[PDB]
Structures are given as structure tokens and as C-alpha cells.
Amino acid sequence: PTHLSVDTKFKTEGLCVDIPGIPKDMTYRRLISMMGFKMNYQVNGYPNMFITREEAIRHVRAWIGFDVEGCHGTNLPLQLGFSTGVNLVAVPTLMYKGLPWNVVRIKIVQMLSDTLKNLSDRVVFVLWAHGFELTSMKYFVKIGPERTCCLCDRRATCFSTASDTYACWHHSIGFDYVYNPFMIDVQQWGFTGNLQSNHDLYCQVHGNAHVASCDAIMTRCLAVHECFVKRVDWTIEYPIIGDELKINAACRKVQHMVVKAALLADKFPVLHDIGNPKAIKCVPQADVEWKFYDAQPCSDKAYKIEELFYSYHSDKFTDGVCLFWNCNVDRYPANSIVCRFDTRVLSNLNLPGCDGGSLYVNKHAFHTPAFDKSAFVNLKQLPFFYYSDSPCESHGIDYVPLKSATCITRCNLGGAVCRHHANEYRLYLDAYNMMISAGFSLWVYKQFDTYNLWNTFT
Ligand SMILES: C[C@H](Oc1ccccc1F)C(=O)O
Ligand SMILES: [Zn+2]
Ligand SMILES: [Zn+2]
């Protein structure tokens, strides 16, 4: 029970308008053969072009929606649409004019390689299969045993007929065939009605401009909805592909800094920590009464503050301060410290999601509801600052004297930042900029003022 058996049944009703007469009784084995591919009884790491829903979820970074619409099918031009927004027109002889397959296949390899090189070791074509997309694969896809890249140790994803060589997404410049792609037909999952009617039940952000790329985007969106919005699996781990470790470490440093300074500046007697049920006190030495409230990361809509706080805990969330560290609510109370992931951010960790939301993949996959500026009406943006009450002592990298109004330390109060605090400030600032650029936004109660931290040095 690891791969999808080629002898598994494939429902063909969705294919019979493009392919009339198609047998009702059909396996993946017969479908792959009908698509013009020969598997040759091969136990060389590629047992099936099609994969299970579980294998698809583990490889969500590889997902590329793909749709083919007949422009006029042997004698007719085809419009090839991808979830990157690209539309290519292939003649048998972003909107691109009609061109023969030998040049279309070069564009396909370039587009996939540039989209996927920093995300995944493969491609998973996410389909809402009606026939033409499956019969078009023979024109740009080659299959065979699992291979390695000619220039590196990564698995091969592309083939070149010019050189008779194989390459990964990073080394495929000039390559013309997609090699050993994977695919999944969403229409096999058991749906009633067409793609648009199922997609529109959960999403208003993607429309139907009636082009192939619109269908491709909708197909991947419906797949993300089914796999990450309604169903949520936090047991699945994802490989490190970027700055995951530094971002996570930075997040822990900023949370401790900000919460510690808020408690020192306003002396709240109670902190209401709302969110992750596995949360730990981020400022363990603080005097404050720390109370926890369990809420898993919402993946569909942001929590209504009325449901989190009301229906009869100190009960009085108005006493002291509320900490919402990645706990996405519709409207934060005025007495809050907030970290909210901005879904609009462009990065290799943040994948496009459903209904304005995004799929943030860092160790685990978290579908996050659309960033909404109106959630922060009772608060303000948290300014950058660095605070430290530790002794001014170097212990144990070169130096240029630090001058900064935001280095809140005893040495800066005394008129000259020490070397230890300058090094810690620069480290903190790098961690802070890393967290911000990853897409996290920080918000605080309007009365927050770092001028109140200077008198903690007496
Ligand atoms: C990020 C990108 O966003 C849109 C794409 C098409 C239409 C509306 C969108 F918001 C996507 O979902 O692929
Ligand atoms: Zn390579
Ligand atoms: Zn959508």
C-alpha cells in the first residue's frame, strides 16, 4: 500500500465526450496504454504515471493544474492551460499564439523548470480529466526508469532529444521533454457536477474567464480545498527547501522579545494565550498569570472572536493582554499582541491556496485564511525595536560601533552601545527581517510605547 496499483479501476464517464465509446471498465494499465505510453513490465522506481491522494498530498509543492481545451484532436489546435496562468496553443500542422508541438514542448519544460526548481524534485499534474489533456501528454512527456541528472545527484525531470541526456529542474535549459511526470485525476474522488460548480462552492477568488489556464487554476484550487481545507493532516512532514529553520528560530526570538517587552512596559497582571494547544510560555521568567486557550490553526475561515471568547478561563479577556501568535481571528480585541501570516507574500514556502488563502508549507502544511487588513482595526503595526536587560559583557566577527535609537539597553541609555549588545542587536535585526520577509506581520495594542522600557534600567 505505497503506490497506486496500475490494476486499480479508473472511472471513464468524464472522458466520454472527448473520447466517445470509451469502455466503462478501465484500469490505469489500459489508460496509460491508450495514452500512447508503454510501461514494458518495469520495476525501476516508476510503477504508475498516476498517484494516490496520499502521495499527492506529500508532494503538494509539485502540484501544477493542467487543462486542455479543443480550440477547434488530430486535425484541431489545442489550448494548453497551466495553474501558473500560462496558455499555449499547439497546432498539429497569458495567451500565446498557435505553434507546432516541437516548440510548445520546449516552452513547457522551461515553464515547469522555473516554477518548480526551488519547490520540488518532481511535477504532479492536477487534472479534472475530460480526455484531450491525457491524449496530449504523448507530445511532451517521455517515460522510463527513474534516472539521475547529468550535471548533479537530483532525480531527472526532463529529457533532451538533442543530446540524448537527462536533467533535473535546475539543469534543464534547452531540454524538450518532461521526463517521468506524475498526475492525479481529481474527477476520480467522487464528485457530482462539473469543475466550476464544485470549485465555486468554496472559492470566489478564481473566476472562469473561459480559458484553459482558468480551469487548471480551479482544478488545483479544488484539490487544495479537499486535501488541506476540509481535511487537515499535521502528521505529514515536508522536506527543508529554504530558510525554514532560520525563519522558525527567528519567530521564537521575536515572540519572546515582543511579549517580554509588552509585559515590562505595561505590567499586565494576566496574559490570555490563545492558539496552538501545544504552546509553551514564551517568557517563562515573567511574573504574569499565564492562561492558555486551545485553538488549532484555522485552515478555512478566520475564527470569529465571538465564538473564541463567548459562550461562558479568567472569562474576562478584557483584563490584561491577549496573545494571538498565528491564531487568525476576524477582529482582534484592542488589548492584543498579534502575529498574523500575510497570505499575499511571495516565497518558495507559501503556495497559492483556496478562496484568497494560501498554503504555507514549513515542516507541516498549513492552509491559512486570506489576509484581511480590517482584522487589525483596534491595533497598530508593531514597530521594530530590540530590548535587553542582560549585562554588558562581550565574552569570547569584527566591529563597527552601533548607533541606534531602537537599541533599548543600559549601555545605550548611558550614551554608548557596548559590543555584546551591538552584536545581539544586529543578530536580532537579521532574525526580525527574516520573519517579516517570510510573510509574518506584527501588531500591538495602541498604547504600546518602547519609551516605557527605558525605566526598567534603574
Ligand atoms: C496567486 C494566484 O491568484 C489568482 C489567480 C487567478 C485569479 C485570482 C487569483 F487570486 C493563484 O491562485 O494562482
Ligand atoms: Zn541537476
Ligand atoms: Zn479557487
Ligand SMILES: [Zn+2]
Ligand atoms: Zn550593553
